[PDB]
């Protein structure tokens, strides 16, 4: 069933739906989920959601199409900016706490880290390490303080870092970056002070093959390095590190088989997510048993902010790639995702399952219908529809789950009833149609399943009692509430019920009772000058009347013959009999050979 975390997320989904269906302007998913890390005690989920929130606060699609946005350059600039800022504030908190101001914070961390070195020290601390680590926190004004103090062994770095903090894309003049590269490989690369090389690297986008394992030991640090290093400008084509190349690099090294095997999923996920690719992150994180719900709800959050490149066609993969994108990212088969998440607790606690189901509403299907409907129509039938799912009629509809977030339920009811109808679960669909206030459909459906049993004898362990009570309750509700159905179907229904009672009395053994019943039906000959109209009466009789006329006529003939043998009146009786013969003598409708055989046999025998 559910876990406390699962039911917690669930309740929150309830709340978001009660928001969107009420017409309130509310905080979107990401906000609720963010706060839903301190309602229950945790440590990591909080961090994941922090990352998600910070990474989704972007200018949302400065275009008209999601693909355009998620492949435009400026969009990726926004992504990398948000990402960098998150990493940097993260590391800032990490040090600021683990050390137990900023300018001396980094200083103390250096002192509690490490006690050839280029360009000496200031205040007794090596300048290059100071510069690097104080940039690492995303604070340049401290680096500005340093380069104001430390200014006597540089002066190219001075204006370098100046025009670094002058363009908001952190890009220098082209020739500036080029002379930085030229000085780097010519006097800087071959040095024994790595830190200086790392600083010149990030500040000048140099040597995109270096990883600096010594100073950026941590995977998070590695992300910092490469993202601080990536470039969208085209300066040389040999140190141009393209963000798509980095996404491919990470997808290579991290994930696609390495995710589940390394038993540190949260961190891997933050990696795969900070790199401007959401789909392939959730798709992995969704697989591990520990972090199913967190992945699924990150996906829902993303979808609600319309930040998702979902699968347009229908396939059998969760994460898919359609060989048309420039690079894009693997598309996420959103529908299959919701399905393969709900199916765990769908057939046990469907109340909450229906809640997730709602989100697929505007996502069409193969047939041309909302997938949401073709989803409910399975849950509600294979989990034995209750009133809590739809409701119970009397003359008044009981509110159900589907009511609480959708108006005009009659739509959903008609749909699911038709679906269960095609499925061959007919009786249940009759009940549903009745819960929908649609008389013609209820009655036409009951017609079929009523037709064949109307002459089957009492037969203990049958359906007759059940369907009889069903149709009787139908009659009560409809004739009492003044509900009237289509004439040619209402008529056939009431004829079928009167015939039910007639045959009950017949089987029971009341001759004259059933006889006046069959008289007052005008289905069979009563006078030799009316049989010509009897022949005209049908050609409007549906298959129902056909599928029993045989036994109707047979039973009637039985009544007549019993009266005759048990009996002047026999003239009238046998005249009615030969009229019946003439009737059967010209029926195009259903019969059997033995039907007319017994008919004419009893006829000539009573003669």
């Amino acid at each position, epitope marked *: 069933s559910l876990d406390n975390v699962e039911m917690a997320y669930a309740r929150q989904m309830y709340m978001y739906n009660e928001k969107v269906v009420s017409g309130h302007l509310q905080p979107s998913l990401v906000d609720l989920c963010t706060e839903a890390a301190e309602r229950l005690d945790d440590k990591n989920v909080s961090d994941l959601w922090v990352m998600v929130k910070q990474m989704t606060d972007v200018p949302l699609i400065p275009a008209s199409d999601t693909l355009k946005s998620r492949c435009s350059g400026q969009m990726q600039m926004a992504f990398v900016r948000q990402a960098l800022n998150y990493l940097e504030q993260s590391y800032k908190n990490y040090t600021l706490i683990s050390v137990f101001g900023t300018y001396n914070l980094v200083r103390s961390f250096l002192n509690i880290r490490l006690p050839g070195l280029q360009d000496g020290e200031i205040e007794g601390y090596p300048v290059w390490a100071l510069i690097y680590y104080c940039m690492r926190c995303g604070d340049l004004m401290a680096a500005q303080q340093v380069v104001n103090r430390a200014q006597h062994q540089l002066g190219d770095f001075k204006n370098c870092f100046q025009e670094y903090i002058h363009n908001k894309d952190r890009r220098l003049s082209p020739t500036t970056e080029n002379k930085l590269r030229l000085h780097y490989r010519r006097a800087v690369r071959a040095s024994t002070d790595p830190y200086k090389r790392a600083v010149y690297c990030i500040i000048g986008r140099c040597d995109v093959s270096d990883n600096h394992s010594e100073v950026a030991d941590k995977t998070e640090d590695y992300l910092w390095l490469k993202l601080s290093q990536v470039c969208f400008e085209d300066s040389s084509p040999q140190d141009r590190l393209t963000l798509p190349q980095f996404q491919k690099q990470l997808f290579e090294d991290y994930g696609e088989s390495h995710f*589940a095997v390394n038993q540190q999923p949260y961190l891997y996920f933050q990696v795969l997510f900070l790199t401007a690719q959401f789909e392939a992150a959730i798709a992995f994180l969704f*697989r591990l048993e520990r972090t199913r719900c967190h992945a699924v709800h990150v996906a829902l959050a993303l979808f609600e902010l319309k930040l998702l490149l979902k699968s347009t066609g229908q396939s059998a993969q969760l994460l898919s790639q359609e060989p048309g994108e420039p690079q894009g990212v693997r598309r996420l088969n959103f529908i299959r995702l919701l399905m393969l998440y709900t199916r765990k607790f769908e057939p046990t606690d469907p109340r909450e399952a229906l809640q997730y189901f709602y989100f697929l509403r505007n996502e069409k299907d193969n047939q041309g219908e909302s997938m949401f409907l073709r989803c409910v129509s399975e849950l509600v039938i294979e989990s034995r529809e209750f009133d809590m799912l739809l409701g119970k009629l009397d003359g008044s509809r009981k509110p159900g789950a589907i009511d609480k977030f959708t108006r005009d339920t009659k739509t959903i009811i008609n749909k699911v009833a038709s679906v269960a109808e095609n499925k061959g679960l007919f009786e249940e669909a009759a009940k549903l149609y009745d819960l929908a206030k649609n008389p013609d459909k209820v009655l036409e459906l009951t017609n079929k399943l009523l037709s064949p049993v109307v002459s089957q004898i009492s037969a203990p362990q049958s359906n007759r009692e059940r369907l009889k009570n069903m149709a009787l309750a139908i009659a009560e509700r409809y004739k009492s509430q003044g509900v009237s159905a289509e004439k040619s179907i209402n008529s056939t229904f009431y004829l079928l019920l009167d015939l039910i009672t007639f045959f009950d009395e017949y089987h029971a053994g009341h001759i004259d009772l059933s006889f006046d019943v069959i008289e007052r039906l005008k289905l069979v000959p009563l006078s030799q000058d009316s049989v010509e109209e009897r022949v005209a009466a049908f050609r409007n009789f549906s298959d129902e009347i056909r599928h029993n006329l045989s036994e109707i006529l047979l039973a009637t003939m039985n009544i007549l013959f019993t009266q005759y043998k048990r009996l002047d009146k026999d003239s009238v009786l046998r005249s009615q009999a030969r009229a019946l013969i003439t009737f059967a003598g010209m029926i195009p409708y259903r019969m059997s050979g033995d039907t007319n055989a017994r008919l004419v046999q009893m006829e000539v025998l009573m003669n």
Partner: nanobody
Amino acid sequence: QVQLVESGGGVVQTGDSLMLSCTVSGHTIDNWAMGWFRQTPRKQREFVAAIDKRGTGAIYGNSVKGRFTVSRDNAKNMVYLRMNSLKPEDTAVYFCAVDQLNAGLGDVSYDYDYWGQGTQVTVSS
């Protein structure tokens, strides 16, 4: 329909080593991943092992870490689970299912679509 045969079970004794096999019936397993689960009366289903589509690396369950081995032979279209140092609880029917989702190495039952029928095993201590 692409069915499966999940065979190699039987009754064995404690501390022995059992080789459970599975053979695909009607497809080429080079895109899919493979998974060996077990059905006990303890639960309805649990996880044992799952191997990716490259035949290189696999995830082992919550308790069985460091006692089993799994492999897939694309050239033989077979799935192999060889065990060591069994436990009384392992009297169970082991299933071998297929992963198409084309991502990761799932460890939850529902993620897989097709199945064989199972191979029953019974350890007698």
